[PDB]
């Protein structure tokens, strides 16, 4: 999803379903590649 070569337009935004896997969110929230990382109803650290 994040490393996809080309992205969709906002009006026809793509949706990917995630299921049956282990999500290591550190890989995301510890990366310095994102300008905005805003989490609602959850705290990023707790995601793990």
């Amino acid at each position: 999803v994040f490393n996809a070569t080309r992205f969709a337009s906002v009006y026809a935004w793509n949706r990917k379903r995630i299921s049956n896997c282990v999500a290591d969110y550190s890989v995301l929230y510890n990366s310095a590649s994102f300008s905005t990382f805003k989490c609602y109803g959850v705290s990023p650290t707790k995601l793990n």
Binding site: A32, S35, P44
Partner: protein, 49 residues
Amino acid sequence: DLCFTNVYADSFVIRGDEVRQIAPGQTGKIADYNYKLPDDFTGCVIAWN
């Protein structure tokens, strides 16, 4: 109009976009690893280019 027992002037330099991280209850590189304000901070934050 106010008195206080002590004042602490904590001085440092950051880049513009990180100024928002110098505030109570913020997250990010600065707020996490460099300088963290308490949730009950009582004071002023001054920044200029």
